[PDB]
Ligand binder design. Structure first.
Ligand SMILES: [Fe+3]
Ligand SMILES: [Fe+3]
Ligand SMILES: [Fe+3]
Ligand SMILES: [Fe+3]
Lengths: 346, 346
């Protein structure tokens, strides 16, 4: 019962240690530009806002209506929803991620630096995403919570190496990409629910998506400033991450049965148009235009090579990674322990 | 709406940086002695084992029996249970905690060192504690989930400084203490539930308690070996933590209404005999005998002073911190947002 492992060599602290000073200098700047993208706790939605209310007389009927609706939502979509929920639930790993980063790490667990305040508060916001989807999937009766909980335990135990090498450059590019990815992901399931006429479930996915849009805005703004101060290193960091390919946070998924669980879950999300290879290319393309990589000047030869590589990649990937004649048609049906080994098309 | 902050100066990296080598050397030893205290994932219980089963025909009646029982469990006890659950849910902070420690930190998020494997797997085990208590409290109808979720968001945002100063010495003493504390805590609520005749809730707290006992065993064994290799530094580290006083992980608790929420929750736990000042002294006394501090020899003058201080403290605290004539009697009743501002004796 061995979960999959990272296949790449672990590289640590690739950012020159003096460049830490940059992020220490940017402390006040982060307070003024990044922290403002967090919603104050009093103003935030909570999972309870979107679930049957167990302290109301309407509890039983609300749970019943939730379940009646869940019967008309196909297994395909539950697999995706479950995979999205499990990814959210591995949260501890993601706080650890941010806290591996050299200039921005929380050194005590309650550090008053803007970066540490961001990290803690961002985590606190993400925590509600798992909570809400958890209780929704639980109440639905459509999924195998024991197997899902098992997957979650494996996933936190496996952790993840995003290949950011303790560099806030690589790291903040990585989270920029991921935040947009989950925005699209959750946004698509929201839109699809709004179409089976499940408004309450659309509200669940929509509210989570809107959190992710704020996070994306914040992280792209950090990288924006890194392109301002250090155009060379940031382009070289952007390019590095592209060459490696952005590996997803939950790629070591394992449920004790399926040795390729991430690929299989991803295939369903692909087929349903929740999150696709096309989406991957669209995100890279968006970040190129967002950070105005095309518009950068005064770069090193190595920087120019990196700049050119980044701008070329999305149309290249949009091609190279389009020819899914194999994946779309032939695709077999396979059991997912997350739904009691009921089967869905891959 | 400001949550409480840490009142003490943040001190970082007080362990001499060469002493990191000790923990790197102990990698194989940790694999052989510490890692063995983790239960393999297939063998672990999951929250679903202890909750109404939403994929069975018995769901509705199981949820109903849970709620009928919960009506007979007093508000006092729910306040404590809720505070215990919130403490568990702040989990990300505690993984961050372990990953501040100099010789034992996970440098990538998926490091194959024994320490990093411990940290990830321990986290994965703790994650089920919050999950289980969350869904239990949610289904009960007895508590205000929105205000609880709010408190959790503040708590993760606030984080915590356990004053371990990046030292695995201070840190592994700290977790040894906390693990025992939660064992007693969850164990006492188990025992009390077994007495209102709520066997299913007793099972919930009991299974969590039993996890904590394994964690305590593992952490006391690490400190045991630190006393073997470095008797001087370990006694100086033990004494340092005692002088500071062990501050609890959830001490910055805030729900947007009560500026002394931890004190108030703690008072209820004290009054109910769930976790007391006497428990605090008993734990220190246990760890003194467990690590055989009395039996240590060949120490520095500074070491001897620290050794003597540690042995003296528990009887001293058992006295000094017994005279709770004020707390026991006079104690007022106060609202807790966690139970819709219904009131309980402090
Ligand atoms: Fe999220
Ligand atoms: Fe996000
Ligand atoms: Fe726990
Ligand atoms: Fe524990």
């Amino acid at each position: 019962f061995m979960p999959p492992r990272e296949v790449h060599v672990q590289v640590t602290h690739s950012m020159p240690p003096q460049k830490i000073e940059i992020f220490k200098s940017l402390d006040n700047w982060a307070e003024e530009n990044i922290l403002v993208h967090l919603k104050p706790v009093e103003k935030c939605w909570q999972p309870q806002d979107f679930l049957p209310d167990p302290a109301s007389d309407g509890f039983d009927e609300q749970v019943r209506e939730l379940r009646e609706r869940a019967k008309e939502i196909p297994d395909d979509y539950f697999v995706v929803l479950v995979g999205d929920m499990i990814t959210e639930e591995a949260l501890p790993t993601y706080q650890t991620m941010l806290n591996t980063l050299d200039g921005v790490r929380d050194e005590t667990g309650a550090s008053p630096t803007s970066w540490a305040i961001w990290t803690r508060a961002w985590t606190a916001e993400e925590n509600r995403h798992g909570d809400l989807l958890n209780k929704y999937l639980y109440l639905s009766g459509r999924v195998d919570m024991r197997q899902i909980e098992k997957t979650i335990q494996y996933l936190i135990g496996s952790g993840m190496d995003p290949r950011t090498e303790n560099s806030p450059y690589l790291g903040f590019i990585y989270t920029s990409f991921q935040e947009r990815a989950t925005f699209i992901s959750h946004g698509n399931t929201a839109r699809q629910a709004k179409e089976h006429g499940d408004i309450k479930l659309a509200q669940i996915c929509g509210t989570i998506a809107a959190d992710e849009k704020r996070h994306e805005t914040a992280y792209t703004k950090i990288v924006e400033k890194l392109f301002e101060i250090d155009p060379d290193g940031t382009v070289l960091a952007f390019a590095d991450m592209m060459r490696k390919k952005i590996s997803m946070p939950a790629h070591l998924m394992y449920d004790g049965r399926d040795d390729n669980l991430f690929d299989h879950f991803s295939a369903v999300a692909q087929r349903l148009g929740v999150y696709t290879a096309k989406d991957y290319a669209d995100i890279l393309e968006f970040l190129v235009g967002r950070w105005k990589v095309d518009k950068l000047t005064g770069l090193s030869a190595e920087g120019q090579k990196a700049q050119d590589y980044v701008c070329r990649l999305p149309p290249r990937i949009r091609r190279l990674e389009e020819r899914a004649q194999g994946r779309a048609k032939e695709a077999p049906t396979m059991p997912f322990s997350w739904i009691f080994d009921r089967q869905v098309k891959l």
